[PDB]
């Protein structure tokens, strides 16, 4: 129903440590509870499985009426993630409701790294590569993971 949006964040942050999401870290700044630092391990058996990907997450003034803003900080070869780190996710825009959480957003990105949809692309060059040259697209994804996504 409602609560103050620091109280909301507080509750969500407490549960993110009380029980974390497998493969994901997510901690806010004690200076600004709106800004989060996230890291996501690349899912198993995906072209990203070897690396760690860093994200920035901002909770806007009217959260959870408005959805969280997200930006990839790590460079990645992915149909739905563009040159500036912007993401295409249904839950962020069309399927957002106040009932959903940060936890929901992070699981959706994790699900997206494991299963791209180049049929609704953001990075158009790499989507047509994903459609027409799939094995080579995954080759370039595995390569960029090694070049840019540190290790682990």
């Amino acid at each position: 129903g409602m609560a103050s949006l620091p109280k909301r964040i507080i509750k969500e942050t407490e549960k993110l440590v009380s029980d974390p999401v497998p493969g994901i870290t997510a901690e806010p700044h004690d200076d600004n509870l709106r800004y989060f630092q996230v890291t996501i391990e690349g899912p198993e058996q995906s072209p990203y499985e070897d690396g760690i990907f860093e994200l920035e997450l901002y909770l806007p003034d009217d959260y959870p009426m408005e959805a969280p803003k997200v930006r990839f900080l790590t460079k990645i070869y992915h149909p739905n993630i563009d040159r500036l780190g912007r993401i295409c996710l249904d839950v962020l825009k069309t399927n957002w409701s106040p009932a959903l959480q940060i936890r929901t957003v992070l699981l959706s990105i994790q699900a997206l790294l494991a299963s791209p949809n180049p049929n609704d692309p953001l990075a158009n060059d790499v989507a047509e590569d994903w459609i027409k040259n799939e094995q080579g697209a995954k080759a370039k994804a595995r390569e960029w993971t090694k070049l840019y996504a540190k290790k682990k």
């Binding site: 103050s4 004690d30 009217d62 180049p118």
Partner: protein, 994 residues
């Protein structure tokens, strides 16, 4: 000059009614009989709305008692005819509406020259029946309304033939089709709900296969589910392939009205309140009996709070139910308590009940001129008896209620002198000075609210007056444009009721965390309640939270065109405004925005970013580059789009224009880049014939395959993209020509473009190293700086909406989307809210009726009402406020909205922590101040060393490295906690008293 509408004056009302309704209104001559309070509240709204002519008629003289609700009368005018003196003031409301006085109504044929006739309480029923009969037989539309204290009614008679053209006014529903089965079943794309009803009509377009289905033919809709409907057999049309957009269509509906003579005996009721269904037939006989009483008594209404007159009115009402047995039915006796109350209050003249009917009736006057919206059919009765105070405190009898020779005698007649004194001495805070703010002030001016010794009004609004405000903010005149709303509105209402002269404190301040030095503890504590006249939800959610903190009542109110609502927020009793509000409209997906629009809302949102990129953000980067020493190396590690920021600066030095001709060139080149090159690049990646994975067409469903644009200076949207583009660019660089020279001329822009070389398209660290190196030193570029543009949607001379509409439409042409004009683009990109005075006036009436209950400190929740209204239908709903939900920790119960913990003194963290444990049995796990987490139990032991021994003020500085200011007396804190079992519990906030 028939067929011209001033789009700047009527802007916001034009989104409610539209062009055809208003072209018909300016064809209508309207007459109003009776210019007491209710009269003017109609004329004011009808004149503001804009009719061909307003004619008024009240040749009877002004008495002091008339000022109880006649805001256009002062004590100067006493002894003079109300029609004459009022008519000069209405003339100021709208220059496009002549206002005349009818000097005599000696004959009923004088009515021939009017399309609408409005009879008010000053007109007797014998005359109303005769006027109505002449009107019905002659084809003149007739409306009537009466208010008797806390009661009122309205009647509507538009003749045997009246055609509703649009019954709702809702922008017609529309959606994309995925399957049309041979039987006619239509399924929706991506499972989006059509939002239709049984009996609606749709036309289709773009439905491949069923060719003739798209010719504009209509199709009646039978709703199957939320995601499907049926239209009837389509076998004859062919067989469905793909595509399709259905578009709801409004078909005319003919209707007939019964005359007043007929409806007095066999009435058709539109109801206002669910829990008062019975009172309508009761007040139908009552309002009639009042007229019969007056003809028995030399024209006089019953004496106020008199049992002899009320006992007769009961008798008179009983004889009517024998004469009109249909009305009450069978088994239904007369309600004698309700008729005695009617008789007690006949003289009564209440501001709130007047503004209510003033808007309701005026809206029906407008429906009569236009055929827009569904008229009332035909009687409506209404009463707000629960506004009456507790007789244990403010008793009503023949003494307490008598006139005192003041403008408030008719209000004193209903409530009594004590209560009227208590209103006067109240202390109010009004946030906002717009349409609602204005009507609020004018209601309070009539009540005398704030005029008492220890009463006052505080009104604040940081905004200034502009032309379109005048369409519904009637305290402002043309000469006041560019001035401050609250200040002029404060003056305005003092001219109405000098009893407030010096008791309204008109401020100019915004209400946020930054002005809590002005609106501090002592300010809020002294107030009796707060009233909200604001539009934007962030400021209202703030005020709502200040009221929870200080425990003050709050009256919220809002209109959306013809729709309105009221909300009462009561300490320790009801929810708050933030407790439950519905979510906003979903945002546009980035991929849809960037590459795949299919709806003009998408192109307009793309053109708005582009307007911000060219003419605002580019010039902010360049000016920082030219002034801030480290901006170059700052960007390298601070911004996100480092590439584009450096690009923007580079382009601003490469393409530095020197004459207006260079700007025209720049614009034409941007046309190619945006509507030619980028589409070709998109099509290069995803051709029209592209297949997806799985192998079904890429451009399908919600996707429209674009076509690149060949520039054409004779295409209006191409021409104006380069004109507004040229002019906005020129502004950045301080270049001469611009639109103050003349009107734009295709031929002279053509000469420039014709001689241009335009490049063909080719399918497209060290990147930045170039950009960084290829930028000169700023010192080099002496004497030069850009002037960024400041998007204002209501200056027509400034080219802003001209660019967004042309840019939006050019991109619409790419994706084969129907172009829109300036007024529509200005509505979506301006995020404009439709607003008309009828609803505004009305909603304000309801809020002031709920104010009486605050003045009496009503603690019974069932006395209050939250109102909903949709004047288009019309529909009036009234619900009980929602009770504040209750929580519970450690068996102790608390109010989830209003209660909290209070700790005096700047306390040490661990003191607070153990204090809670040994008092409430609670274990603080999380603790924040504002947006800063001050304590958390998952913190490392070394983190907790820093903090646990610190007072909260020093703790705030530790975390934020910036300290509380001296003026701060309190601090709110949010906490998570666990109970005695270690299970989590919801708990209220903490207030610290420093």
């Amino acid at each position: 000059a028939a067929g011209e509408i001033d789009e700047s004056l009527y802007s916001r009302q034009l989104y409610v009614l539209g062009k055809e309704a208003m072209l018909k209104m300016q064809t209508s001559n309207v007459l109003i009989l009776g210019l007491k309070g209710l009269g003017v509240e109609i004329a004011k709204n009808v004149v503001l709305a804009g009719v061909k002519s307003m004619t008024v008629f009240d040749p009877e003289p002004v008495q002091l008692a008339d000022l109880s609700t006649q805001f256009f009368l002062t004590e100067k005018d006493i002894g003079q005819k109300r029609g004459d003196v009022t008519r000069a003031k209405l003339a100021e409301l709208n220059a496009y509406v002549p206002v005349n006085v009818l000097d005599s109504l000696d004959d009923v044929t004088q009515l021939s020259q009017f399309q609408v006739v409005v009879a008010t309480d000053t007109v007797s029923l014998e005359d109303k029946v005769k006027i109505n009969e002449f009107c019905h037989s002659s084809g003149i539309r007739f409306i009537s309304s009466e208010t008797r204290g806390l009661f009122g009614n309205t009647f509507v008679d538009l003749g045997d033939e009246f055609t509703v053209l649009d019954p709702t006014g809702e922008e017609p529903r529309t959606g994309m089709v995925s399957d049309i089965e041979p039987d006619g079943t239509v399924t929706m794309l991506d499972d989006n709900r059509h939002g239709l009803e049984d009996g609606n009509f749709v036309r289709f377009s773009e439905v491949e296969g069923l060719d003739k289905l798209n010719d504009g033919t209509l199709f009646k809709v039978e709703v199957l589910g939320p995601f499907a409907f049926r239209i009837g057999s389509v076998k004859e049309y062919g067989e469905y392939k793909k595509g399709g957009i259905f578009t709801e269509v409004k078909v005319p509906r003919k209707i007939s009205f019964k005359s007043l003579k007929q409806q007095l005996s066999n009435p058709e009721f539109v109801f206002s309140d669910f829990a008062k269904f019975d009172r309508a037939a009761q007040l139908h006989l009552g309002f009639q009996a009042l007229h019969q009483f007056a003809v028995r008594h030399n024209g006089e209404l019953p004496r106020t709070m008199n049992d002899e007159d009320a006992n007769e009115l009961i008798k008179l009402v009983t004889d009517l139910s024998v004469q009109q047995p249909e009305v009450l039915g069978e088994g239904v006796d007369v309600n004698e308590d309700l008729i005695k109350e009617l008789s007690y209050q006949a003289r009564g003249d209440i501001p709130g009940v007047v503004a209510f009917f003033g808007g309701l009736v005026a809206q029906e006057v407008l429906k009569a001129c236009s055929g827009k919206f569904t008229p009332l059919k035909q009687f409506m009765y209404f009463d707000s008896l629960e506004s009456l105070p507790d007789p244990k405190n403010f008793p009503r009898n023949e003494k307490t209620t008598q006139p005192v020779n003041s403008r408030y005698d008719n209000q004193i007649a209903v409530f009594g002198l004590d209560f009227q004194k208590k209103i006067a001495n109240s202390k109010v805070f009004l946030v906002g000075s717009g349409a609602i703010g204005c009507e609020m002030l004018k209601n309070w001016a009539l009540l005398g609210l704030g005029s008492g010794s220890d009463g006052y009004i505080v009104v604040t609004d940081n905004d200034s007056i502009e032309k379109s405000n005048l369409n519904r903010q009637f305290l402002f005149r043309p000469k006041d444009v560019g001035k401050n709303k609250s200040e002029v509105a404060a003056e305005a209402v003092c001219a109405m009721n000098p009893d407030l002269k010096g008791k309204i404190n008109a401020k100019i301040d915004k209400v946020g965390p930054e002005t809590e030095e002005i609106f501090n503890d002592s300010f809020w504590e002294s107030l009796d309640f707060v009233t909200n006249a604001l539009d934007n939800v962030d400021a209202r959610t703030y005020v709502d939270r200040r009221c929870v903190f200080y425990r003050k009542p709050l009256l919220e109110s809002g209109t959306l065109g013809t729709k309105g609502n009221t909300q009462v927020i009561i300490p320790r009793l009801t929810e708050s405004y933030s407790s439950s509000r519905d979510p906003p409209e979903k945002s546009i997906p980035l991929c849809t925005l960037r590459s795949f629009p299919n709806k003009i809302d998408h192109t307009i949102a793309w053109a708005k970013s582009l307007f911000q990129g060219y003419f605002t953000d580019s010039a902010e980067n360049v000016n920082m580059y030219l002034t801030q020493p480290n901006f170059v190396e700052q960007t390298l590690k601070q911004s996100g789009d480092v590439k584009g920021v450096l690009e923007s600066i580079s382009d601003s030095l490469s393409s530095k224009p020197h004459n207006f001709e260079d700007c025209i060139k720049w614009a034409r080149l941007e046309f190619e880049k945006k509507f030619n090159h980028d589409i070709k690049q998109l099509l290069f990646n995803f051709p029209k014939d592209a297949k997806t994975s799985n192998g079904e067409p890429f451009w399908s469903g919600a996707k429209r395959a674009p076509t690149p644009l060949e520039f054409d200076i004779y295409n209006n949207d191409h021409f104006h993209f380069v004109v507004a583009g040229a002019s906005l660019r020129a502004y950045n660089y301080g270049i001469k020509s611009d639109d103050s020279n003349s009107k734009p001329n295709v031929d002279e822009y053509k000469s420039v473009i014709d001689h241009m070389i335009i490049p063909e398209f080719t399918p497209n660290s060290d990147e930045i190293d170039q950009l960084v190196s290829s930028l000169p030193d700023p010192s080099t570029l002496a004497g030069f700086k850009l002037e960024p543009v400041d998007f204002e949607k209501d200056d027509d001379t400034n080219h802003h909406i001209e660019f967004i509409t042309a840019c939006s439409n050019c991109r619409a042409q790419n994706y084969f989307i129907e172009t829109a004009d300036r007024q529509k683009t200005k509505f979506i990109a301006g995020r404009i809210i439709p607003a008309i005075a009828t609803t505004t006036s009305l909603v304000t009436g309801l809020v002031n009726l709920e104010l009486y209950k605050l003045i009496d400190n009503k603690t019974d929740i069932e006395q209050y009402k939250n109102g909903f209204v949709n004047l288009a239908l019309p529909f009036f709903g009234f619900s009980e406020p929602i009770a504040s939900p209750k929580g519970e920790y450690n068996n102790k119960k608390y109010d989830k909205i209003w209660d909290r913990f209070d700790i005096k003194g700047d306390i040490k963290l661990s003191d607070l922590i153990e204090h809670f444990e040994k008092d409430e049995g609670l274990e603080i796990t999380m603790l924040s101040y504002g947006v800063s987490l001050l304590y958390a139990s998952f913190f490392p032991p070394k983190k907790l060393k820093e903090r646990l021994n610190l007072p909260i003020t020093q703790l705030v500085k530790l975390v934020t490295k910036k300290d509380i200011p001296a003026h701060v007396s309190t601090m709110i804190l949010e906490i998570c906690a666990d109970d005695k079992e270690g299970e989590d519990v919801e708990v209220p906030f903490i207030t610290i008293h420093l």
